Amino acid sequence: TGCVLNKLFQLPTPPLSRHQLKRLEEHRYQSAGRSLLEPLMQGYWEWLVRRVPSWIAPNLITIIGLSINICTTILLVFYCPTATEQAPLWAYIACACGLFIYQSLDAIDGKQARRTNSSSPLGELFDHGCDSLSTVFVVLGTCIAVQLGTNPDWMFFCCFAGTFMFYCAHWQTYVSGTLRFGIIDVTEVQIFIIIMHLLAVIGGPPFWQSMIPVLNIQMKIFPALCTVAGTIFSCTNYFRVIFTGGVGKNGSTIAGTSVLSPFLHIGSVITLAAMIYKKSAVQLFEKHPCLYILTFGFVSAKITNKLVVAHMTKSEMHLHDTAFIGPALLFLDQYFNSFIDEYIVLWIALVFSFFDLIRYCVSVCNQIASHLHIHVFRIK
Amino acid sequence: TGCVLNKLFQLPTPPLSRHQLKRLEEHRYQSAGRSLLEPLMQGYWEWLVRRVPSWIAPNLITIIGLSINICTTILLVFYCPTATEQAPLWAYIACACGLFIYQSLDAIDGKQARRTNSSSPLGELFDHGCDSLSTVFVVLGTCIAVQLGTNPDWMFFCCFAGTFMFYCAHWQTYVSGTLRFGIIDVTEVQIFIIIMHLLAVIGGPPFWQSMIPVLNIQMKIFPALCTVAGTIFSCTNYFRVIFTGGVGKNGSTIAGTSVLSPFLHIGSVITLAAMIYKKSAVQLFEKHPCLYILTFGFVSAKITNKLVVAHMTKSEMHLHDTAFIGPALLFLDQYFNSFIDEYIVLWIALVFSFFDLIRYCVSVCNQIASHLHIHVFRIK
Ligand SMILES: C[N+](C)(C)CCOP(=O)([O-])OP(=O)(O)OC[C@H]1O[C@@H](n2ccc(N)nc2=O)[C@H](O)[C@@H]1O
Ligand SMILES: C[N+](C)(C)CCOP(=O)([O-])OP(=O)(O)OC[C@H]1O[C@@H](n2ccc(N)nc2=O)[C@H](O)[C@@H]1O
Ligand SMILES: [Mg+2]
Ligand SMILES: [Mg+2]
Ligand SMILES: [Mg+2]
Ligand SMILES: [Mg+2]
C-alpha cells in the first residue's frame, strides 16, 4: 500500500536539476518594508510563539493552519454552493475563528524557525507555497459571506484579482529579490475579511441587500469597489518596481529572463477562466460557482508555486505545464458544444488539478529534503 | 536591408546546444534495403550524375528541385483552387515533367556528394528536410489531378495519410538508426503519380467520372482505396520494427525516450486538422481546400524536420512548438463562433506557418554550417 501510494505522488522525472538545488542552497532571504498594522500585532505574536514547545517543527504548524482553513471553508462551501443560501451563523464564526488561527499560526512559524535554528530553504518554499493555496479559499469564503454568487461578473473579477495581486507580489520578488510589504497587505485584507464575516453574522442578507443612499449602488459592490480601488493602488506600487527595479543585466530579471515573462502564466489562467465563462451555454459558473473557483484556484496556486520554485532556483519559467490540462479538458469540451455535461467535466478537472498540485508539491519537497538531509515535518 | 532581413530569419535563441552539434558530428549514415524499381533506374541516374559538373554543390540541386516542384504545383493550385475546375492540359504536363525532374535531381544529389567528398551532416538534414516539404505538394497536386475536392472526406484522409506515412518512415529511423526501404516506397508512389497525371491529360473528367462496373464505386475512390491498402501494408512493415527493434536501453529509442513519443506530434497535427474540419460552420475546407492543405502541410513539414533534427542530435522531442500557433489561431477563431472570417484567419495562419518554417530551417542550417565551417550552397 505504501509503495503504490508513494509512486502515485512522486513525479516520474525529478523537477529540479542538480545545479539549481545547489544554487538554491546559496539563496539568502531578504525582506524590506513594514505594514501599517504589523507593529501592534508583533507584541501579541511574540507572546504566542514563546508558548509553542520547541520540539514542534515549523512546517507542521503551517499544515495545521491549512487544514483548519480548508475544513472551515469547505464546510461553508458545503452549506452554500450557489452562494445564495444562508448558512447557520456558527459556520461563519468557525470560518472567522479559523482565519484568525491561520493568521496567528502563519505569523509565528518563522519566529519559531528562527528561535530553533531550523530556518531552511524548504521552509521558505513551503510557507509561500502554503500562502498561495490559502488565498483562493479566503477570498472564496469572503464571496460566500457576502452572497456574491447572485452577481457573477463582480464575483469573477474579485476572486481572480486577489489571486493575480498575490501572484504579482511574488512577481516583484522574482525580479528584485526582496519581499516588499505595502501599507495595505495580507494583514489588512485578512483583518477586513474577519470583520466582514462578523457583519454577515450580525446583519445577514437584509443588511447586504440594503441600499447605500448616497451612491445608489448595492452594498455588495462596495467590497468589489474596494477590490477595484485596492487593485489599482497595489498594482501601481508593484508595477513601478518591475519596470525600474530590475537588478539583472540590462535591467532584466535576476534569472536573465524578460520582466514580462511571469505575466503570461497568470494571464493565461485568468484568460482561460474568462474564455470558459463567456462561451458556456449552460451558465456553468452561475449554477456551480464554488466548484469553478476551486478548480482554477488549484491551477493558479500551482502556477504561483512554480514561480516560487523558479525564484528559489533562479530559473526560467516554462509556459507549458501539466496544470493547464484540466482547464484544457473543460476548454475542449466547450469546443464540441458540450457533448458531455460540463458539470461532470468540471469535477474531472477539479480532481485532476488537485492531484496534480499535490503530486508536484510532494515530489519537490521530498527531493529537496533528501538533498539537504532534513525531515520536512520533524526536527532532529 | 541585409541586416534586417538576416535578423528576420534567424531565431532569437540558438536551437541546438553545443553538446548536440558535437554529437551530430559523430553521426554516421546507415541505410538498408532495396526498392523494387530502384535497380533499373540506377543505370539512368548513374549516367545523369556524371554529366553534372563537379563545381555544383549538392544542396543547390535540391533547392532547384524544390523550386521547380513548388512553381509547377502552385501554378496548378492557381488554376484549380476548389479542385473542381479543369486546368489547361500543359499545366499537368509541366507538373508531370517537374516531378520527373525532382525525382531525377533528388536521386543524383547523394551520388554527386559521394563523388566530390562533400558528404556532410548538413547535406543529410537538408535532403530529408527537402523531402518533407515536397511530399505535401506532390499529394496535393495528385488530388487536383483527380479532382478529389468534390469528395472532401476522401481528400482529407489521403493527403494526411501520405504525410503521416512519410513521418512514420522517419519515426522508424529515429528508433532504429537505419533507413529501411520497402517494396513500395517513394519511387513507386511517385511513378504511380506521374502516370496518373498523364491519364488525367488523356481522359479528363469523363474518365474520372466513369463507373467501374465490377465494384459499383466511383473511379475517384480507387487511388484513395489504394491509399488505404498502401497505408495498412506500409504501417504493418513499419510498426513491427518500432515495437520489436528498439536498440536503446530496455528496448527504448536511441535517445532513451518512449517509442510512442513521436506519435503525439504528428497525431496532434492530424487531430487539429480533424477538429477544424468537423466543427467549421462555413464548410471551410470545401470552399478553400488547397489553402488548407498548404497551411497544415507547412506545420507537418516542420514537425517532420524537427524529428530529423531530433534524430541527428539524439535528443528528445518537445511537444510544445511555435508551429502549432498558426493552427491554434484557427482553432481559437472557431471557438468564438468565427467572429472573424475563417478565410482571412487561414491566410494569416498560412503566412505565419510558412515564415516560421523558413525561420527555423535558415537558423538551424546557418548554425550548423558555421560550426562545421562549410558553406551550405558552395564547395570550397
Ligand atoms: C507579514 N506576516 C509576518 C504577518 C506574514 C507574512 O510573512 P511570511 O509568512 O511570508 O514570512 P515572515 O515575514 O513570517 O518570515 C518568516 C520567515 O521564516 C522562514 N521560514 C518560514 C516557514 C518555515 N516553515 N520555515 C522557515 O524557516 C522564511 O525564511 C520566512 O521568510
Ligand atoms: C531512394 N532514392 C535514392 C531514389 C531517393 C531517396 O533517398 P534519399 O534522398 O533520402 O537518400 P539517398 O539514398 O539518395 O542517399 C544519399 C545520401 O547522400 C547524402 N547527402 C544528401 C544530400 C546532400 N545535399 N548531401 C549529402 O551528402 C546523405 O548522406 C544521403 O543519405
Ligand atoms: Mg510566517
Ligand atoms: Mg507565510
Ligand atoms: Mg538524394
Ligand atoms: Mg532525398
Residue numbers in the entry:
A (entry chain A), B (entry chain B): 28 to 407
What does the paper say about this structure?
Choline/ethanolamine phosphotransferase 1 (CEPT1) catalyzes the last step of the biosynthesis of PC and PE in the Kennedy pathway by transferring the substituted phosphate group from CDP-choline/ethanolamine to diacylglycerol. CPT1, CEPT1 and EPT1 belong to the CDP-alcohol phosphotransferase (CDP-AP) family, whose members share a common property of catalyzing the transfer of a substituted phosphate group from a CDP-linked donor to an acceptor alcohol. CEPT1 is a dimer with 10 transmembrane segments (TMs) in each protomer. TMs 1-6 constitute a conserved catalytic domain with an interior hydrophobic chamber accommodating a PC-like density.
We, therefore, incubated purified enzyme with 10 mM CDP-choline and then prepared cryo-samples. Eventually, we obtained a 3D map at 3.8 Å resolution. The overall structure is almost identical to our first structure with r.m.s.d. of 0.4 Å over 368 Cα atoms. However, the lipid-shaped density disappeared in the hydrophobic chamber, and a new density arose in the catalytic cavity. The CDP-choline molecule matches well with the new density. CDP-choline is primarily coordinated by the CDP-binding motif. The cytidine group is sandwiched between TM2 and TM3 and potentially forms hydrogen bonds with Asn86 and Glu151. Minor shifts of TMs 2/3 were observed to leave efficient space to accommodate the cytidine moiety. The pyrophosphate moiety is stabilized by the two metal ions that are coordinated by four conserved aspartate residues from the CDP-binding motif. The trimethylammonium group of choline may also be stabilized by Glu65, similar to what we observed in the PC coordination.
